[PDB]
């Protein structure tokens, strides 16, 4: 009933008791494990999710059972009973947001979970206004290369009307232009979103790195187009510490990883537009973004530049180039004074985080296939660390694309 959890490098053992607080089913059953899938497919119920969350909050500030706690429970009941919904207080929002990060099983950066700047944008009534907040968030989060984790929360969903939505999957993204050749110029991941932008009247560039505009949707209205002022979008040109020719590849990446298509659930309330950012781990750029075959697919190009044997897999040309590319990323970010974390530092701090959460909560939900980096996996301590995965609330969930 309580899972024994073992680290195979050190022979140490814990027990996850936290998983007993899961109220939401995952995809696995005793018959088959579906844990490597990316997405598997009343008032009473909101009220009890709301109760639980308010309880989580008052306990977190140690005022559990106090008058303030009782009267807030009553406020919530009064509100659901009359209106079918309720609203969060700003500090409750702040607590839920941090907790949603904390509960995120696919996130290796959770050591930082308590350091999060939260912008309340719930007084937002237009796509225009959404853009102003988005700009402030970017200016703040970027902070001249000295990245600071942030979230911005737009108005919750409501039963009789459409969602506030950011169509873009991240705040900063490079266009992907389908060519005549069936080829793709730019980021292949953003072909569809580039097309949408164009359908809504954007004049498109024709580079491998064109920063895309945002499509912002206020309730029940067409999406609106907003260009980010180049000045707000910090970018880092990639070079390599020893290989002079690398810079000539003209490669570059944006500083700010800001997810914008995920839904934030707090005490049963859903926030369909709640972008959040922190900073990159180098393997995301150096390994996935640049080396995935269905992304920029630069591996072969680099290896030929390195005069490596492409003829055969056994020279490990792929592994050699990947390392250099990840190295280029760390070097370049370090030269441009922009926050980055390599995958050894990140995962060492994740181990520390599992230890903190063991003492603090009796466990930590973690998704092994996501926590382990995409190169050099067993070289990192997370690789040898058994992990239990499950869903706690507050939570970030995936949501369907708005079109």
Ligand X SMILES: Cc1cc(N)nc(CCc2cncc(CCc3cc(C)nc(N)c3)c2)c1
Ligand Y SMILES: C[C@H](O)[C@H](O)[C@H]1CNc2nc(N)[nH]c(=O)c2N1
β-pairing verdict for 269-271 and 252-254: unpaired
Interface mask toward ligand X for 32-61; x: CB under 6 A: ------xx----------------------
Phi-psi region of 143 (alpha: psi -120 to 50; beta: other; left: phi over 0): left
CA nearest to 280, candidates 292, 290, 295, 266: 290
284, 324, 357, 367: which one binds ligand X (CB under 6 A): 284
**Residue 35 binding target from ligand X, Zn ion, ligand HEM, none, CB below 5 to 8 Å by type:** Zn ion
Residue 314 binds a copy of itself (CB under 8 A): yes
Other CB atoms within a 10 A radius of the CB of residue 385 amount to 22
**Residue 393 binding target from Zn ion, ligand Y, ligand HEM, none, CB below 5 to 8 Å by type:** none
Give least dist CB 153 to ligand HEM, A.
11
Q: Which of 92, 265, 284, 357 is catalytic?
A: 284
Other CB atoms within a 10 A radius of the CB of residue 57 amount to 23
- Cβ distance 177 to 198 under 8 Å? no
134/341 with CB nearer ligand Y:
341
Residue 25 binds a copy of itself (CB under 8 A): yes
**Residue 390 binding target from ligand HEM, a copy of itself, ligand Y, none, CB below 5 to 8 Å by type:** a copy of itself
Catalytic annotation on 110? yes
Where along the sequence are the contacts to ligand Y (CB under 6 A)? 8, 36, 38, 369-370, 383-386
CA nearest to 167, candidates 261, 259, 233: 261
4, 63, 89, 144: which one binds a copy of itself (CB under 8 A): 4
Residue 140 binds a copy of itself (CB under 8 A): no
Q: Which of 92, 102, 110, 208 is catalytic?
A: 110
Rounded to the nearest 10°, the torsion over CA 393, 396, 397, 399 is: 140
- Cβ distance 86 to 269 under 8 Å? yes
140/370 with CB nearer ligand Y:
370
CA nearest to 274, candidates 108, 359, 394, 142: 394
Residue 245 binds ligand X (CB under 6 A): no
Residue 308 binds a copy of itself (CB under 8 A): no
DSSP secondary structure code for residue 381 in this structure: G
* CA atoms of 88 and 336, how far apart (whole Å): 40
Give least dist CB 28 to Zn ion, A.
3
Which residues, 6 or more positions from 48, have their beta carbon under 8 angstroms from its beta carbon? none
26/205 with CB nearer ligand HEM:
26
CA nearest to 357, candidates 385, 330, 338, 329: 385
58, 164, 276, 296: which one binds ligand X (CB under 6 A): 276
In 61-126, which residue ranges form alpha helices assigned H by DSSP?
67-83, 90-102
Q: Is the bond preceding residue 394 a cis peptide, omega within 30 degrees?
A: yes
63/139 with CB nearer ligand HEM:
139
Contacting residues toward ligand X, per CB under 6 A? 38-39, 109, 169, 257, 259, 261, 276-281, 284, 398
Give catalytic residues, as residue numbers.
107, 110, 279, 284
Contacting residues toward Zn ion, per CB under 5 A? 28, 33, 35
């Amino acid at each position: 009933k309580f899972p024994r959890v073992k680290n195979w490098e050190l022979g140490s053992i814990t027990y996850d008791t936290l998983c007993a607080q899961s109220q939401q089913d995952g995809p696995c059953t005793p018959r088959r494990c579906l844990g490597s899938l990316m997405l598997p497919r009343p008032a009473e119920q909101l009220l009890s999710q709301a109760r639980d969350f308010i309880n989580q909050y008052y306990s977190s500030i140690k005022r559990s059972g106090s008058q303030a706690h009782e009267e807030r429970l009553q406020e919530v009941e009064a509100e659901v009973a009359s209106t079918g919904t309720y609203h969060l207080r700003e500090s409750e929002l702040v607590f839920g947001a941090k907790q949603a990060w904390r509960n995120a099983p696919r996130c290796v950066g959770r050591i930082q979970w308590g350091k999060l700047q939260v912008f309340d944008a719930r007084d937002c009534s237009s796509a225009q206004e959404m853009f102003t907040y988005i700009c402030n968030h970017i200016k703040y989060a970027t902070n001249r290369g000295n990245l600071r984790s942030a979230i911005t929360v737009f108005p919750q969903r409501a039963p009789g009307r459409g969602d506030f939505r950011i169509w873009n999957s991240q705040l900063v993204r490079y266009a992907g232009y389908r060519q005549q050749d069936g080829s793709v110029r730019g980021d292949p991941a953003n072909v569809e979103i580039t097309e949408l932008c164009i359908q809504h009247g954007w004049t498109p560039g024709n580079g491998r790195f064109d920063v895309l505009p945002l499509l912002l949707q206020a309730p029940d209205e067409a999406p609106e187009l907003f260009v980010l002022p180049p000045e707000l979008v910090l970018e880092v040109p990639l070079e390599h510490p020893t290989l002079e020719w690398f810079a000539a590849l003209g490669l570059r990446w944006y500083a700010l990883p800001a997810v914008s298509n995920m839904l934030l659930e707090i005490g049963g309330l859903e926030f369909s537009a709640a972008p959040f950012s922190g900073w990159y781990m180098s393997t995301e750029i150096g390994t996935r973004d640049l080396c995935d075959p269905h992304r920029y697919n630069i591996l072969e190009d680099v290896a030929v530049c390195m005069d490596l044997d492409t003829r055969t897999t056994s020279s490990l040309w792929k592994d050699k180039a990947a390392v250099e590319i990840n190295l280029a990323v760390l070097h370049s970010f370090q030269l441009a004074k922009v926050t980055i974390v390599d995958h050894h530092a990140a995962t060492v701090s994740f181990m520390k985080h599992l230890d903190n959460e063991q003492k603090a909560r009796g466990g930590c939900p973690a998704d092994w296939a996501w926590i382990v980096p995409p190169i050099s996996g067993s070289l990192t301590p997370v690789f040898h660390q058994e992990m239990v995965n499950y869903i706690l609330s507050p939570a970030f969930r995936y949501q369907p694309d708005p079109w």
